[model samples]
Target chain A: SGFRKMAFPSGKVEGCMVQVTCGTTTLNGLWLDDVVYCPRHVICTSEDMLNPNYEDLLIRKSNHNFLVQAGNVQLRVIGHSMQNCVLKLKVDTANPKTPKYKFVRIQPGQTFSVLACYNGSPSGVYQCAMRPNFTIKGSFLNGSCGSVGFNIDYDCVSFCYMHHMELPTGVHAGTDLEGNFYGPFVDRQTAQAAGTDTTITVNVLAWLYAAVINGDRWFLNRFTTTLNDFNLVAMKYNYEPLTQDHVDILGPLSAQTGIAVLDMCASLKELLQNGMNGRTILGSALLEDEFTPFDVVRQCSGVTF
Target chain B: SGFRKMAFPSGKVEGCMVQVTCGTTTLNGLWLDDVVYCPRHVICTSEDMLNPNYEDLLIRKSNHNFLVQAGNVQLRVIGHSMQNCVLKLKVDTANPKTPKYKFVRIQPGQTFSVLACYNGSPSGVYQCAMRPNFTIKGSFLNGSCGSVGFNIDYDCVSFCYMHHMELPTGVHAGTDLEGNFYGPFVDRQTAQAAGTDTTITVNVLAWLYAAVINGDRWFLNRFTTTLNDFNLVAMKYNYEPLTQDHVDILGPLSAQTGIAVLDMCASLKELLQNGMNGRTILGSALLEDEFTPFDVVRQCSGVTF
Candidate 1:
């Protein structure tokens, strides 16, 4: 349907290799990278030019080195600085009154060590800063050192816009753009070799979409009385209240922009009729679905609008 | 066997008759009567003469009159004074706050009335002073007036110095010196006429003596450790410690002057040997005896000392 082409010096092949094409019109010189790319029938318009600062859309990676060692109630920190920097380490332990701290200077790519004593049990955390001005920092490393101190449980990946707050227990997944897994990747190379690296993304997308729909219904249920009151006033004056009905009317408009709304009118009507009993039925149905949102209209027999 | 006789004036006969005698000699002119009596051995010792202030040994009697009337959350008191006095009345109710009081001058045999308002429930009691300066008083009159106040549950009779703290359930008795039935007497006049007044006294004496021994053991058990420690030190030094044991030893000495002592040495020794477990066994034995302190050496098989 469309095509474009541009040339690049073979010697200037930067980070990674990418192919560019639109239908059979392959962009010969375009490396298919960075913030923007040319599409079919699209001239290089002012608005279409790449915005250089587009880090928000790409996955971020870090290369800071830090390590900790526990001995004789003393913690030793070794850090490799990427720039001429002052390495500062802060330690916290059982005695909250007297937290310990240490600082040392390191040249570029040079390693530095800082040590501090802990009075009580080593059940706290540590934070390290590499900048000369201590204000600059990133994520704090787990001070537990895998065995001596506190263990941290963290959500490795989270997508706010998709309402993907947490993954289900035992469901391991990652968020990487180049098919390279990051943390807790048991078989990253083999998974990518077998073309199964996209499995987690596909499953997450389906799970997130279902959760969003259920969340919408929950919001609707919470404000049912307020909506019902408005509807009563609107009916008396020959008008329609702004509610799910109006939301449904905007569904088609939203779908044109790749934002589709699930129809919950039938379930909503059934719930409005039965009130709390309908909620109990919905909860039972969701539980039967193993906590995964399913087709309420077909599965919930109590939902008879 | 002993005998006594005494004489009384024929015209100046005051309270009651008297008999005078010594050893085998008997004097004439003695007649037995009610209310008061006298016995003699020819000499009027100072201790034998009535001290006039010896009311502590005599049953106290009163002839004061008091009544209460309720109106509009207020109680009114109407009382008759038996002596020239300041009639003081005190009132208490379920609501402890705002206890009411009124004092007024009253002449001998004069009627007086006092009024007080209660802020809370009408359930209350009122007491009136019978003597001048309001030092003497008797049991409270139910201001509820057999109507709208708190009712009192009371024991008809209680004995002091005899260990008769409370009567067993279903067993009713009274304190009447002449065997004239006084309180809670179903057939008071008939009981007196039937000469059954001494019956309760006989039973009470037996019951009270047993209760006193058990009470002594209970007191001993409560302070067993302290007593045991003192006894241990005393035994090491070959000396007697001041305790209930010394009291029991002096009991017979005091009995020479008319004070009697109950012998509980056998039971007490058995209890000291077995400690707390022995107390439990003694409790069970007493319960089985219907709370009557009988011969422990013969009845309690647990007593093995």
Candidate 2:
């Protein structure tokens, strides 16, 4: 039913527009512009220009290298194995800073790409992390790498229930249907054995269970509807102009993930809810993993975890 | 100069309007219109109408009579024996029930009046209780038989400290200016004997010292903001419409003034802050203590106490 072995050259491919799909339906004709970065040019630029952190990258799109201001990057999750995945992308240079990245669940055999805006820096290292249960990965890539791929097998607890329960309201001590029992699995094959359906009740039960069992005094502590932690971070740095610290330190190089870190945190939260017993294991994996520039670039290419 | 010894004849003094004056000031002006009863019409209404529980009177006003609506019934504190003494008034209504009260520190000889509304059963049995080291004779009339008044006496702690000092933070204690060990007086005579310029601190010290020496928890245990046993009666009926059980059993009445009867459980919370200790005490007393009422007809007017 689908074309097999499609070849996508690096040049702006036809029908390369990434459709903006909300929920299940695509926002008709709403496509994100592609981004193109000359890694060679960025590497040759002054160290001050090229080594800017993630924030500086944003400003570079608007200021000096105005040509590669692709509005938003888009990426598709492709070929997620136990340890590897690929992303495909299309990029435009008109509005490079605000790249529109599309986050998609990992699917088999998909590719995505994005334009790499060169700030005249040598190839740099970056990190990628998944949240609601922080799982991280990192790598180094030249500004010209243009695209990257990854595979997430750490497993999320989106559908997992925290506190298992008996009808009589006793402690729920049993393996979660979603393969989130106790110890961490080494690979997807091992983790898939515990996967199960997601229900609203399960979601609620997980949180309540964690609050009670984990003994968080402010259990059921929820962010206010208006001001969430993510937004707080966003607003905090919104007014400040992009600085070099943002380009270099704000990325995979630093322990903090800048604004995107919140998303990671949220993801980790989800994982914890689903896999309460394995929370520490999953949390450790998230914090310790290294991230590569290609992974960061891939996220910019409109791919989301 | 005055009708000091005159035995006025007991006869109907009929008039459309009568003005009663104290010195040159007009205290009250009564106007007679279409009415079923007059001051001369002694039909034993006191049994049913006069001494009716305050809440029953209010309910009657709402259902059968329209005498005291939301904007009626004024209340005031007329006189006190101490400069810094707290007087609390609590009211319980039969219909839309809530315990709302206020506290006021009366300056000596200050005449204050309050307007009370009554359409049905008046807010049952308005209770005026003293607080913060003072007790006043609370009655419905003044010197006259139809009036109410109370003889106020300052307890030792009331005059313990006229000014702030660092020592004895929780316990009321201080030294007089004359180097005499002024004390916390148990009653008015002790406080008076301490003299005008006398530093009064020992009365409170007596209790505190006794508690420490005798190792008694009774005095040592603080009635901090955490515990609120005094107004337990009124708090029990908070937001609960006065029921027959409440009225017949005097539950409603006990609850309203109960807060004043007991020591403050916690420190005084910020007045402007909502949901803090500011809202701890319930009833009209809270309103009257905070805001002064306008229109005497719409207030709870009574003899000084």
Candidate 3:
């Protein structure tokens, strides 16, 4: 749930032995005493004359004063400074050696802000330092440095569908049960609304079923595996799974075809509400555990991920 | 051949009744005399004499010394300055009153550059000026301001075809006379090579003919009228025109359909060689009588425009 801690000992130097733990990893071996041990959160400092292992040396623990906020596809970094300083902020995801950096010139009591974006969910550590060149007065109180780490989970299916549909790929418009045709939407809200609306569900099902009946492999290829997985999970929940029989029944029907509109609507409605709802289909395909449309929708709307 | 000259009057104010011309369309009624007039390119300056017309006297003529060069669908603005002056360059097409501006700080005896692009052939003026706040010394010579105007004539059909083919707008791959299929090219050189080489011309003709027969109006609509016009012009040059019958013959034939490939090649070759050549087609389309492709291309490529 929180940070894991590991402890180790510095080789005894008679007067200079130190106990090191994972959380305060950087403070190991700095003290000049054999019996000194620092806790996970404690910062060892030699400012007082009573613990006079060194003269006039001050090494206090520094806490990161950096904040990160996320937008649709971007992150905003906010940095606070305690003194007039030239600051360099570095952000890294997956790799620490290769990080994106931004420089800011700030005064004491002032804040600096920078914005950036990356593909996929942005999870990373942001580190900042009061550059040595700009230190005209005393050194930074907390070892002249600070860092903050963050990880955000996102709705992969919503992001994927929105991205794919925005491009000029082969996906075409599908009709709903109410005879209203819609698609090629640019955002998740519109796509999700069309996917869940009662009348719209019928048309979406017909479009998918038509692809199967007509042997449109290109269209089917993108979603068949995901749809099948959704069907399997849905069948466990007492919903009907889409099969060749369904395709056979709905395939040949057009607006001008002899199939009754009511029959098509009823079949499509049952399939959509019980079998292909976003929570049932996308959640099954994307999430780790079985979740309903309401759960998935609530998760998507919340700020935690 | 060159800039046209306009004449005007300058009443005698002894040392101040100086006449200026060939620039400065902005300095119209600032003169004291009723009969005074200014030309299309002139700047009146008085640095030594006092009682200057305005207070805080920022009556500095900040000429735009930038020249714009066009390539494909983009433009590169070239700027030259005599001092380290901060320049604000504005480019406007269709409207000179409200132009897009870019600020550049240029060093003395050095050049500054900016790049921009516009849809269609760029035909407009690019104006620049030395920012008054940054002008530490004397103003720019030759009245402190300048502008460059440009108008480029391009091969609309070649550019259009190349642009459309580069995009994924559903124009499929087509076979050549040698039965090799290729398409969705990124540039004109590749398309022309595929269209002109001996076996290649056969497939290119097949593709064009197929569009006419299948009534693929989107593809045919762009080129049909141009093709017909080229045919009429080609007849004057002793060449046979492509007809509806050619489409009828090639439409039903597949690679296995026992049709004379050589016959199709000869007809397409004669027509392409004499009719659809860039010089003949674009020349007729873009130029007026008494002007040829050579004249248009030369003018378009020259520094004058």
- Candidate 2, residues A88-207: lDDT per residue as tens digits? 123323322222233344211112221111222111111122211111111112221222222321211111111111111111111121223222222111112222212121112222
Candidate 1 accuracy as lDDT? 0.20
Give the distance in Å from residue A195's predicted Cα in candidate 1 to where it truly belongs: 75
Best by lDDT: 3
For model 3 the local lDDT of residue B128 reads 15
The deviation in Å at residue B88 for candidate 3 is 21
Instruction: Indicate the residue-level lDDT of B255 in model 3.
Output: 35
Interface RMSD of 1: 54.4
Q: TM-score of predicted model 2?
A: 0.13
Q: How far is A186's C-alpha from truth in model 1 (Å)?
A: 76
Give the per-residue lDDT of model 3 (tens digit) for B93-166. 22211112222223111111100112111111111111111111110112212211111122110000000111
Candidate 1 clashes between residue pairs 3 or more apart in a chain or in different chains: A4-A27, A6-A29, A7-A29, B5-B19, B5-B20, B6-B19, B6-B20, B123-B149, B123-B150
Residues A1-305 of candidate 3: C-alpha lDDT, one tens digit per residue: 00000000000111111222223322211121111111112222233312432112212322242222122212222221111111222222122111122222232111111000111111111111111121111101121112111111231100000001111221122111111222423211132222211111222344333322323222221122334554554455434354544344444443323333344334433543454332222112111111112222222222211
Candidate 1, DockQ score (0 to 1): 0.00
- Ordered list by lDDT, greatest first: 3, 2, 1
Show model 1 residue runs off by greater than 4 Å. Answer: A1-305, B1-75, B80-263, B282-305
Best-fitting candidate, scored by TM-score: 3
Candidate 1 lDDT, B1-305, residue by residue in tens: 00000001011111011222222322211111211111111122235333322232112322121221122232222211111101112222221221121112221111111010111111111111112111111111211001110101121111110000011211222212222222332211122211111111111122223334223234132222344554464344332233464345334322332324223322243343543342332212211111111122111122111
On the 0 to 100 scale, the lDDT of residue A105 in model 3 is: 28
